From a paper:
Intriguingly, the non-protective and low-affinity Fab145026 also shares similar features of utilizing a shallow groove to bind an extended NANP epitope.
The vaccine is based on PfCSP, which densely covers the surface of sporozoites and plays a critical role in the P. falciparum life cycle from the development of sporozoites in the mosquito midgut to liver-stage development in humans. Co-crystal structures also reveal conserved and convergent use of aromatic residues for interaction with the NANP repeat region.
Numbering used by the authors:
A (entry chain H): 1 to 52, 52A, 53 to 82, 82A, 82B, 82C, 83 to 100, 100A, ...
B (entry chain L): 1 to 94, 96 to 214
C (entry chain P): 1 to 11
The structure:
Amino acid sequence: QVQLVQSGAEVKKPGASARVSCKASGYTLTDFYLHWVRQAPGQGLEWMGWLNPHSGGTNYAQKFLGRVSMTRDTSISTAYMELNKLISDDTAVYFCVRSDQEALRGAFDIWGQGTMVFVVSRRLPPSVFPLAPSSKSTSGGTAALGCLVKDYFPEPVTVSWNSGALTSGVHTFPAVLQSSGLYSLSSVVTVPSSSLGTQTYICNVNHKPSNTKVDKKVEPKSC
Amino acid sequence: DIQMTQSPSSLSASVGDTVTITCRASQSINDYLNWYQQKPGKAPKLLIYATSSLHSGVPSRFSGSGFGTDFTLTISSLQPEDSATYLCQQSHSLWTFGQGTKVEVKRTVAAPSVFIFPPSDEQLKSGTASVVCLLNNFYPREAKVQWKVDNALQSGNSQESVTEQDSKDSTYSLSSTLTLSKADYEKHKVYACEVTHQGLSSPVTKSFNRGEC
Amino acid sequence: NPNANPNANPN
């Protein structure tokens, strides 16, 4: 179908530059204005500017003038955004998004999936501890288990279970800020209590800011 | 730049209710006003453009009105999958988004299932001990967790986090984590989380004895 | 109060 497909996350030091690519699929890139919009954690969306992919012309928000470049390669239907002189406040999800100036009066109908840009100076990889299932976490045929992801910085961690094969019943909680200034969260899942003897449950914790990954097998405890 | 504000910032309503969200612009945008739905971890989806036109695929439950600097999004016959943030956006002179209005969809009361997790041996090697209490799939969002260590009520050593509302069943889940020093943890026997909630006629206590796990 | 954004798509 009609979509915009973006490149993967960027981990950058302050003062560096972040590059995001955006590929048009199912429509002709040069037929529509291509916008960049970012969303910092806990905040609303912020329009950065647009690219005319036909002409190469642009219109940048004044906030980003001198810092942002929007370009494209029409031969591979791909647009690019580069943001220079990164600061911590640039940590955000960056979307490319098409507008329709005719039929939709400037509205934004096709959005990319977003690209995370992490501006990282200090970093601490997470400690990952099992939340073991037991009789104390079993209720009416259901057992709960999980992983505690403690003492990391900065955000975010992402957590999958069984390498993405287990998603039903997973709750990965919003992080809390500890008094230390480090973050912590838990990811939990409910499964049939009958499954504890035959299924293995492994939480996969990715902390891109520190380029670390931790897998932890969660086994039952004898209470 | 044109500034956008929305009111209220959050609201709660039952299935079948009609809710209205207002959007204001700092100067006139004629009818170049669009509405989007955003769920956590997703890109926004276009709902309405040019103040009142429904984008392809959007039910007539969604309605828009207004002009100049004042606009309304109306959701009639609210559905569970409507639990989300609704954002307005001007497209008259550059583009500006409102900060969003959070919409919670009420459902029948659902008491939490309660689960407790003792600290791992691996964490005890780090010098701390965290005990986790999970309250699963409940509504409404208000719940209280009280920690008790050998029947003494705790305060000041726990942290709580709540999930976003589920788009399918309209429930929440909640974690409460009690963190002690290892030295303090090893000096006590019974660890308990005591849960209260509209759906519970008396508190639910889950507990364990240290060393038994 | 005319809009300041483009009235046509690039094509």
